[PDB]
Design an enzyme around this catalytic site. Sequence first.
Site, PDB file in Angstrom:
ATOM      1  N   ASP A  15       0.805  -1.220   0.000  1.00 58.36           N
ATOM      2  CA  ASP A  15       0.000   0.000   0.000  1.00 58.36           C
ATOM      3  C   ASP A  15       0.852   1.291   0.000  1.00 58.36           C
ATOM      4  OD1 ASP A  15      -1.025   0.226   3.627  1.00 58.36           O
ATOM      5  OD2 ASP A  15       0.916   0.203   2.669  1.00 58.36           O
ATOM      6  N   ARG A  29       0.990   6.846   0.085  1.00 55.65           N
ATOM      7  CA  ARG A  29       0.073   5.827   0.519  1.00 55.65           C
ATOM      8  C   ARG A  29      -0.992   5.769  -0.587  1.00 55.65           C
ATOM      9  NH1 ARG A  29      -3.541   2.418   1.762  1.00 55.65           N
ATOM     10  NH2 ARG A  29      -4.183   1.955   3.934  1.00 55.65           N
ATOM     11  N   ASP A  34      -6.891  -1.051   1.192  1.00 54.42           N
ATOM     12  CA  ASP A  34      -6.245  -1.675   2.325  1.00 54.42           C
ATOM     13  C   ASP A  34      -5.665  -3.010   1.908  1.00 54.42           C
ATOM     14  OD1 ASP A  34      -6.643   0.387   4.151  1.00 54.42           O
ATOM     15  OD2 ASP A  34      -8.512  -0.473   4.966  1.00 54.42           O
ATOM     16  N   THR A  35      -4.346  -3.104   1.907  1.00 57.00           N
ATOM     17  CA  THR A  35      -3.675  -4.364   1.603  1.00 57.00           C
ATOM     18  C   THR A  35      -3.282  -5.048   2.911  1.00 57.00           C
ATOM     19  OG1 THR A  35      -1.445  -3.380   1.494  1.00 57.00           O
ATOM     20  CG2 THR A  35      -2.737  -3.448  -0.532  1.00 57.00           C
ATOM     21  N   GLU A  37      -0.644  -6.344   5.404  1.00 58.85           N
ATOM     22  CA  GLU A  37       0.636  -5.654   5.525  1.00 58.85           C
ATOM     23  C   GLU A  37       1.748  -6.595   5.937  1.00 58.85           C
ATOM     24  OE1 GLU A  37      -1.873  -1.950   7.146  1.00 58.85           O
ATOM     25  OE2 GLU A  37       0.297  -1.613   7.389  1.00 58.85           O
ATOM     26  N   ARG A  81       2.610  11.283   4.554  1.00 61.30           N
ATOM     27  CA  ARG A  81       2.529  10.545   3.290  1.00 61.30           C
ATOM     28  C   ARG A  81       1.573  11.215   2.294  1.00 61.30           C
ATOM     29  NH1 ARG A  81       0.938   4.525   5.196  1.00 61.30           N
ATOM     30  NH2 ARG A  81      -0.612   5.725   6.411  1.00 61.30           N
TER      31      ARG A  81
END
Length: 135
Positions: A15, A29, A34-35, A37, A81
């Site tokens: 991500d 980002r 939503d990956t 992690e 980010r």
Amino acid sequence: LHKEPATLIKAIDGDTVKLMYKGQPMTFRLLLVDTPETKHPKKGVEKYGPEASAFTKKMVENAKKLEVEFDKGQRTDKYGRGLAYLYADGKMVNEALVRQGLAKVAYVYKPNNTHEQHLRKSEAQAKKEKLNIWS
């Protein structure tokens, strides 16, 4: 929205990518996804975490051209980010991850929601095909 050029510095995980943008290194980002992690503040490495990381890495490393597209709202988060959609040779990395079942569509915050419907449709397709996270 408008696409701007960026150059890869390093893929950090599924991500998050570090890019040279307007002459400065900056962590981005990927908006709306939503990956699983590999870093996770509490959990560390999650299932499909390495897969999602490798997928983003290959996509960005093998591209001729990377571009970032900011949304209509805040362009940075509280961690400094950049918040953007990332394109590798015209293909949106955010979408490619969701379409493969390697990311879910995040909780969305108006007004940073321009590609939300598009991503949701890809997620529904990945769910229907039972891919990866949806397996």
